[PDB]
Every structure is written in C-alpha cells, then in structure tokens.
Coordinates of C-alpha atoms and ligand atoms in Angstrom, one line a residue:
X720 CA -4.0 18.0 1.6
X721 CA -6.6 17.6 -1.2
X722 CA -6.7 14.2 -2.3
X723 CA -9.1 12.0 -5.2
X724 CA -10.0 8.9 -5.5
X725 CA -9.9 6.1 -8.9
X726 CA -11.3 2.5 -8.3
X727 CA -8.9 0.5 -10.7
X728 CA -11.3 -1.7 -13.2
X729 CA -10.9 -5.3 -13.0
X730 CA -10.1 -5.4 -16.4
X731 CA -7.0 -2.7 -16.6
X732 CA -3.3 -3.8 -16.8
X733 CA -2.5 -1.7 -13.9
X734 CA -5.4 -3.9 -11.7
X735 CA -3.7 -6.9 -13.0
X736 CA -0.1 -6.2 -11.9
X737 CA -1.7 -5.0 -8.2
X738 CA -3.6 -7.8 -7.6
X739 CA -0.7 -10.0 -9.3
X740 CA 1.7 -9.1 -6.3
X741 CA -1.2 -9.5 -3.4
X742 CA -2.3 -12.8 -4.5
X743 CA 1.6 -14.3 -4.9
X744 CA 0.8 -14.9 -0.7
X745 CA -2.7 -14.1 -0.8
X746 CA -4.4 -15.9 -3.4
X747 CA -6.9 -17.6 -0.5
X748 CA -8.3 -13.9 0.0
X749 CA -11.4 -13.0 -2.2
X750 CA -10.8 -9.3 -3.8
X751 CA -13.4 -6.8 -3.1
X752 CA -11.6 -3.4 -5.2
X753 CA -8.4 -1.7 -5.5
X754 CA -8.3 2.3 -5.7
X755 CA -5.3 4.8 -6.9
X756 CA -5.4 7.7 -4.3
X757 CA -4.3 10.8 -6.3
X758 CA -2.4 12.9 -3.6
X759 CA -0.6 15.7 -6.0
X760 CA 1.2 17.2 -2.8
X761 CA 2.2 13.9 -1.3
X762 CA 2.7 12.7 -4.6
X763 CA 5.2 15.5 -5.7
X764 CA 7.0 15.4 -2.0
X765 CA 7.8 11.8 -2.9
X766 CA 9.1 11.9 -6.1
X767 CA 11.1 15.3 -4.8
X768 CA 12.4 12.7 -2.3
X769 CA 13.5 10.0 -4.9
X770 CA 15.0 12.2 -7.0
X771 CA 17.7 13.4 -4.7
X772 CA 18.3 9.7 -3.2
X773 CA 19.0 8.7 -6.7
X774 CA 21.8 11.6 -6.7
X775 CA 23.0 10.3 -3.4
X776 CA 22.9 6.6 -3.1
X777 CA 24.6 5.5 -6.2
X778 CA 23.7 2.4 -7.8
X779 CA 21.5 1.6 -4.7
X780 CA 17.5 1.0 -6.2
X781 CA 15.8 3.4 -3.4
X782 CA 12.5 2.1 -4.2
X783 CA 10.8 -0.9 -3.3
X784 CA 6.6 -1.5 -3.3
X785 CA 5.8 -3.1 -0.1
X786 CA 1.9 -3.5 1.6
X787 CA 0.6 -1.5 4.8
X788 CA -2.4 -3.3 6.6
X789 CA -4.9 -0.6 8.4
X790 CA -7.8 -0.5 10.0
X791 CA -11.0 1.4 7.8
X792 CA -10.6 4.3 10.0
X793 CA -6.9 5.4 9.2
X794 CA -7.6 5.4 5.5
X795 CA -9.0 8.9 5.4
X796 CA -6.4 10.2 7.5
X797 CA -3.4 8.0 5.2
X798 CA -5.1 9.1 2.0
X799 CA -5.0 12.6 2.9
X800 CA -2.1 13.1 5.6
X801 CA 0.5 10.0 4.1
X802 CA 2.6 7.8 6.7
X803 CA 3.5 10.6 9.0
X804 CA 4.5 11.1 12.5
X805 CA 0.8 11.1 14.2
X806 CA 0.2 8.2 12.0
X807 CA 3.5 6.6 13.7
X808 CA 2.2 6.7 16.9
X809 CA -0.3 4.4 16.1
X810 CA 2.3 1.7 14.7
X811 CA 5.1 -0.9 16.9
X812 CA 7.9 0.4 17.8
X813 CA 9.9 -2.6 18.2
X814 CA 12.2 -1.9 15.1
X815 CA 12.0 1.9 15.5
X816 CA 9.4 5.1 15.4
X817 CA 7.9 5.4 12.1
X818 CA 5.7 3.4 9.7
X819 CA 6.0 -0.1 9.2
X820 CA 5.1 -1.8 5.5
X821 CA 6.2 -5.6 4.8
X822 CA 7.3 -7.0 1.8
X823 CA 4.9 -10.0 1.7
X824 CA 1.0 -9.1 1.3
X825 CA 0.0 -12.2 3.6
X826 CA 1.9 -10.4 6.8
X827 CA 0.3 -7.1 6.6
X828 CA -2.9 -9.4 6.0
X829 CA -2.8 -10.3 9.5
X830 CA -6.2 -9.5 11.4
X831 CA -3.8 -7.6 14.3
X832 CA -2.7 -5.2 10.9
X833 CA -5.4 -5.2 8.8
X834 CA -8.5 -5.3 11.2
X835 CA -11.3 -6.3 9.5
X836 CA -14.8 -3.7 10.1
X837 CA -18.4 -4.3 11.0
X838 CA -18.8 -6.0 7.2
X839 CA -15.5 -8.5 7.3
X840 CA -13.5 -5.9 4.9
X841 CA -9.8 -5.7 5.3
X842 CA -7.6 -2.7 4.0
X843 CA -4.2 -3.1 2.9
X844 CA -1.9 -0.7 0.9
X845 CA 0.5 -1.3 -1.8
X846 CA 2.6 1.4 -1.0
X847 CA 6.2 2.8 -3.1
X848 CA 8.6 3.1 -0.3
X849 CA 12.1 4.7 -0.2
X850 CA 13.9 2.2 1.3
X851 CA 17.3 3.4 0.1
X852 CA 20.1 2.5 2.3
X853 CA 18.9 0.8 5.2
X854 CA 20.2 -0.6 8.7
X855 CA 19.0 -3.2 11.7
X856 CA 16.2 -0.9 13.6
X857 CA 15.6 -1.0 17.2
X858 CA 13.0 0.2 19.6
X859 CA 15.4 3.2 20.9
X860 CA 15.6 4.8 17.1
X861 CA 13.2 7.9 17.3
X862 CA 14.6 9.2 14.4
X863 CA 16.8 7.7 11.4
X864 CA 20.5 6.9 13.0
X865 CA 23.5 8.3 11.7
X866 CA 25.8 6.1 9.9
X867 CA 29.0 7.5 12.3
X868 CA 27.0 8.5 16.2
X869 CA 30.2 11.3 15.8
X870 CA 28.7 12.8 12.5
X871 CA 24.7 13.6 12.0
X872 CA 24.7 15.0 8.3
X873 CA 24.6 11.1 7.1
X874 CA 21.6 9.1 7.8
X875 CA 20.0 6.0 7.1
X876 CA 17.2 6.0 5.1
X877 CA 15.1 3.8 6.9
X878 CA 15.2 0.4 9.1
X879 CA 14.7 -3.3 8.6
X880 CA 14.5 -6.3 10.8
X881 CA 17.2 -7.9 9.1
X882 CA 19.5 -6.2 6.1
X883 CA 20.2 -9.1 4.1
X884 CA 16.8 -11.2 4.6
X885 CA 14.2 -8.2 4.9
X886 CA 10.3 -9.1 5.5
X887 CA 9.4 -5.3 7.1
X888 CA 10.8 -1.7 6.3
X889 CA 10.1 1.3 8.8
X890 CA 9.9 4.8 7.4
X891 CA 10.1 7.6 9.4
X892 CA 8.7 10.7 7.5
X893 CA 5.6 11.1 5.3
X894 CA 8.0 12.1 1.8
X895 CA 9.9 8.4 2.0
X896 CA 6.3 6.7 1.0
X897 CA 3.4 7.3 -1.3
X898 CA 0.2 5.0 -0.3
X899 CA -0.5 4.3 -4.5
X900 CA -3.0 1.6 -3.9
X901 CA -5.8 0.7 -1.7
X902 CA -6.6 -3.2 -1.9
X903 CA -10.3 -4.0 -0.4
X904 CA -10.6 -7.6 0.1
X905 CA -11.9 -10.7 2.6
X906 CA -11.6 -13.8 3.4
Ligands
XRM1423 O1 1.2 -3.9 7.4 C1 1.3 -3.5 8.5 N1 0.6 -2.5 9.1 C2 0.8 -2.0 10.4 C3 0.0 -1.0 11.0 S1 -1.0 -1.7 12.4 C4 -2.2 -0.5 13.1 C5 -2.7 0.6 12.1 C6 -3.5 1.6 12.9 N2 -4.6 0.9 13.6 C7 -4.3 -0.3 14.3 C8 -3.5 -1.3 13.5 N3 1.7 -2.6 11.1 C9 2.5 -3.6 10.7 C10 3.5 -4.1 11.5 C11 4.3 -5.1 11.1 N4 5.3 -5.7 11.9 C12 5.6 -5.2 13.3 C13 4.7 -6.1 14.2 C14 5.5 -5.9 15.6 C15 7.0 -5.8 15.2 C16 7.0 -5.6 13.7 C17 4.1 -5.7 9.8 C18 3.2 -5.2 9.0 F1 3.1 -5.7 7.8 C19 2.4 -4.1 9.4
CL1424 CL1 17.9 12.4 -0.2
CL1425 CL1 16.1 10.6 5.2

C-alpha cells in the first residue's frame, strides 16, 4: 500500500503524449501538472492481470487508457488503495457496480466527475484499463456476468454502455486498472 509520487516535467516526451490525449477534447482547459503515481503492488497486480488475459483472450487488445474524473479527496485513497470495491461505492451504478473511466477526457471533465476544490482545481486520471472482452452493463450486475448464466467459470471482463460505440468502461476489481497519471488542470 506504499505508494510515491513523480510530477512529469513539461518538457518530457511522456508529458507530451499525456497531455496530447487530454487536450484532443480538452484543449479549452488550462493544465496545472501531471504526476506518475508509482504503486509497485498495484502496479505488479495489474500487469499479473494482463498477462494472463493476454493467454486467454486471443487476439483481443485487453488494454485500453481511458480518464477517471475525482474529487481532491479520493486521490489519496486511489493513489494508495486503486479502483477497488469501497471506491465503487462511491461511483453510478447505472451500467453496473464497479469503477467507471470514459474514453473521451472532456466526459470525465464534467464538474459532477471531476469536482473542482476550494481553488478551482480539477483531478482527472489517465488510467490503463483491462477492458478485455466486454458486454452491455446494467444496474443489476454486482459482479462481472457470466458469458452462459448456466456456467460461472467464464466471465466478462468488464462492461460498457454500448459494445460497438463505447464512450465509458466499468471495472469491477482494483487488478483490471492502474491509475498511471494524475492530470491537475482548470478552466
Ligand atoms: O470519469 C468519471 N469519474 C467518475 C467518478 S464520480 C465521483 C468520484 C467520487 N466522488 C464524487 C464524484 N464517474 C464517472 C461516471 C461516468 N458516467 C456515468 C454517469 C452516470 C451513468 C454513467 C463517466 C465518467 F467519465 C466518470
Ligand atoms: Cl485473466
Ligand atoms: Cl475478471
């Protein structure tokens, strides 16, 4: 559970490709930093996780990087705990019990997401989530359905709203997501 901390200079490739992907719906939003949270436990579950969907799964790319708006108060807890199940309670449920991340910045940007604090600041995360193989989500699904209801041992690996036009994923368990970078900005 012991986390660190790296604000990403300006002036590094890795800013650049971040900041890159937020501003392709969020150019109109003035960047205040971006942080790396260095998690090795959450980290190492993670990769643990993508490793054996990429033995299961096929030619299926399990990965996407999709943005998690937060209030300033759940970023301790995310950049210590990850997206797990008290953190869940805290999300919708409309599409299903778990953590929600959208694939366009400019959604989790919303105030309702993204609250900004006393100062104006808005948090959002760029997040690597296992999407894998993925099915429509509903508010009834407390935990990933089974591809047959007669036969458990295959799951989903997470939700959408819609399978062929996606704008949100929800994960279910803190190994499925890895919260890589923490984007400060306003408007
Ligand atoms: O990025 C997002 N972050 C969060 C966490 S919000 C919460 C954190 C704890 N503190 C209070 C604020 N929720 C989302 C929900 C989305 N869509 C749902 C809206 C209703 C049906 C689908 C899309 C998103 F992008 C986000
Ligand atoms: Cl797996
Ligand atoms: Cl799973």
């Amino acid at each position: 559970q012991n986390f660190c901390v790296v604000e990403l200079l300006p002036s590094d490739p890795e800013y650049n490709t971040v900041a890159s992907k937020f501003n392709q719906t969020c150019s109109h939003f003035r960047i205040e930093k971006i942080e790396r949270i260095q998690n090795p436990d959450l980290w190492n579950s993670y990769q643990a996780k993508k490793k054996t969907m990429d033995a299961k799964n096929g030619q299926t790319m399990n990965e996407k990087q999709l943005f998690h708006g937060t209030d300033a108060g759940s970023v301790p807890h995310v950049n210590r705990n990850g997206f797990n199940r008290s953190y869940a309670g805290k999300n919708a449920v409309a599409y299903g019990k778990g953590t929600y991340f959208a694939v366009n910045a400019n959604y989790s940007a919303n105030d309702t997401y993204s609250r900004p604090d006393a100062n104006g600041r808005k948090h959002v995360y760029y997040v690597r989530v296992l999407t894998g193989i993925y099915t429509h989500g509903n508010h009834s699904l407390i935990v990933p359905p089974s591809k047959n209801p007669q036969n458990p041992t295959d799951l989903y690996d997470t939700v959408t709203d819609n399978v062929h036009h996606p704008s949100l994923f929800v994960a279910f368990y803190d190994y499925q997501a890895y919260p890589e970078y923490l984007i400060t900005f306003r408007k």
